[PDB]
Design a binder for this molecule. Structure first.
Ligand SMILES: Cc1cc2nc3c(=O)[nH]c(=O)nc-3n(C[C@H](O)[C@H](O)[C@H](O)COP(=O)(O)OP(=O)(O)OC[C@H]3O[C@@H](n4cnc5c(N)ncnc54)[C@H](O)[C@@H]3O)c2cc1C
Ligand SMILES: C[NH+](C)c1cc(NC(=O)CNC(C)(C)C)c(O)c2c1C[C@H]1C[C@H]3[C@H]([NH+](C)C)C(O)=C(C(N)=O)C(=O)[C@@]3(O)C(O)=C1C2=O
Length: 368
């Protein structure tokens, strides 16, 4: 049941892009309105791990899991100390190398983009407004023609602004803060640090600061530093490089000389506060027209527990099915049901993520 109409996915993330396929597979008419300028736009951020059981189910259900195993690269993980000592190393074992192999965010999108029918994604669409008209929604896009649709699936990330028709819940900051960079030609530009990783992820922890790194994101080193947000911040300048460098050289003064090599080797740092979009209040029972929310727009959550795209790919799988079912009658109950299941696990995940982030920053911890 439920055909003859069309869908509008605002946001071509990993999650929305997946969602376009699972609908377009079962013959539903979808469009993905994405704000990026063109497909070849560089995606900042590290590597996704799709878990067997959640993320991977979604890639399976679309016929892409082998394509995901093809492009993803399984990684082992070291754990180091401020002095550079390897304390542990779980390398990849031949059977469970298919557990969560790291795939690059652009690689993933290229896979999802091939799966979709041509012109499924209309690019240069920054959705600014939603008016719920007659039998459908009017969607307005900055300096581009408006369009209309029966169902609007919100996939536009943790800081989506058009949530109000679903919930008046708003994102909160978490209390921790994350700095991130890329380093190109890591082998020569951060030679000491690249070696300490030995082709493996690298996770350190000292006195409330946390460093993470991936030595191989298509030949780029991506590292990330996390800390309880300095109290002095409320309501540095990440545009000014050696201003972020000095902050970091203070915070990381006691660490080995090799990590400092990383910091003075990165050109541009990007600042991010950790945020949560809590599943506290049940979303509105009263909704003018059919609308729902998957991905980081549904449950933005701290990036410290492997959740985020997996919850998002799952809630893609779940919702997508509820629509393609003749096992449903009313779309209002077809999404009410997707929203039932996600409140369960998102909360489960948010609890984990919020929990893990309490765990670190608290005096020297062991890792997972
Ligand atoms: C430091 C860090 C590390 C993380 N690590 C992991 C990890 O290791 N594993 C994991 O599973 N998750 C991780 N996450 C979380 C993860 O990136 C998200 O859960 C994931 O990106 C999925 O969200 P979307 O794809 O659901 O949202 P997004 O990735 O945020 O994609 C949103 C899309 O919609 C577009 N868009 C945004 N606004 C608009 C608009 N107004 N109109 C139209 N389009 C719009 C965007 O441009 C983009 O294409 C991490 C996050 C951070 C900050
Ligand atoms: C507890 N912390 C340490 C943690 C835990 C898990 N796993 C679990 O919580 C599940 N617990 C089990 C193991 C099932 C018992 C985790 O799965 C993770 C993480 C940490 C993040 C670190 C991220 C990092 N960024 C933020 C700087 C990074 O460099 C990368 C990367 N590949 O480049 C990440 O992808 C990162 O986001 C990431 O994946 C983390 C975890 O996967």
């Amino acid at each position: 049941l439920l055909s003859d109409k069309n869908v509008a996915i605002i946001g071509g993330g990993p999650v929305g892009l997946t969602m376009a396929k699972l609908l377009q597979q079962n013959g539903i008419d979808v469009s993905v309105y994405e704000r990026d300028n063109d497909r070849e736009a560089r995606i900042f951020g590290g590597t996704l791990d799709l878990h067997k059981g959640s993320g991977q189910e979604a890639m399976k259900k679309a016929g892409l899991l082998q394509t995901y195993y093809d492009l993803a690269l399984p990684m082992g993980v070291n754990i180091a100390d401020k002095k550079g000592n390897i304390l542990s190393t779980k390398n990849v074992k031949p059977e469970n190398r298919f557990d969560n192999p790291e795939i690059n965010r652009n690689d993933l999108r290229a896979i999802l983009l091939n799966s979709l029918e041509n012109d499924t994604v209309i690019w240069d669409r920054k959705l600014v407004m939603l008016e719920p008209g007659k039998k459908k929604w009017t969607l307005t896009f900055e300096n581009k023609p408006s369009e209309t649709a029966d169902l609007v699936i919100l996939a536009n990330g943790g800081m989506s602004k058009v949530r109000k028709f679903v919930t008046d819940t708003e994102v909160e900051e978490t209390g921790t803060f994350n700095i991130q960079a890329d380093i190109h030609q890591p082998e020569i530009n951060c030679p000491g640090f690249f070696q300490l990783c030995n082709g493996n992820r690298l996770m350190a922890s000292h006195q409330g600061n946390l460093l993470f790194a991936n030595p191989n994101n298509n030949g780029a080193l991506h590292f990330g530093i996390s800390f309880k947000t300095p109290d002095e911040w409320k309501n540095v300048d990440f545009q000014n490089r050696n201003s972020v460098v000095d902050f970091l050289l203070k915070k990381f003064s006691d660490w080995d000389e090799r990590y400092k090599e990383l910091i003075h080797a990165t050109l541009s740092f990007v600042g991010l506060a950790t945020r949560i979009f809590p599943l506290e209040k049940p979303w509105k029972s009263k909704r003018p027209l059919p609308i729902t929310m998957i991905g980081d727009a549904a449950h933005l959550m701290p990036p410290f527990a492997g959740q985020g795209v997996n919850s998002g790919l799952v809630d893609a799988l779940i919702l997508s099915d509820n629509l393609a079912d003749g096992k449903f009658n009313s779309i209002e109950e077809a999404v009410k049901n997707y929203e039932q299941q996600m409140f369960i696990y998102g909360k489960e995940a948010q609890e984990e993520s919020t929990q893990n982030e309490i765990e670190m920053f608290k005096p020297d911890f062991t890792f997972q």
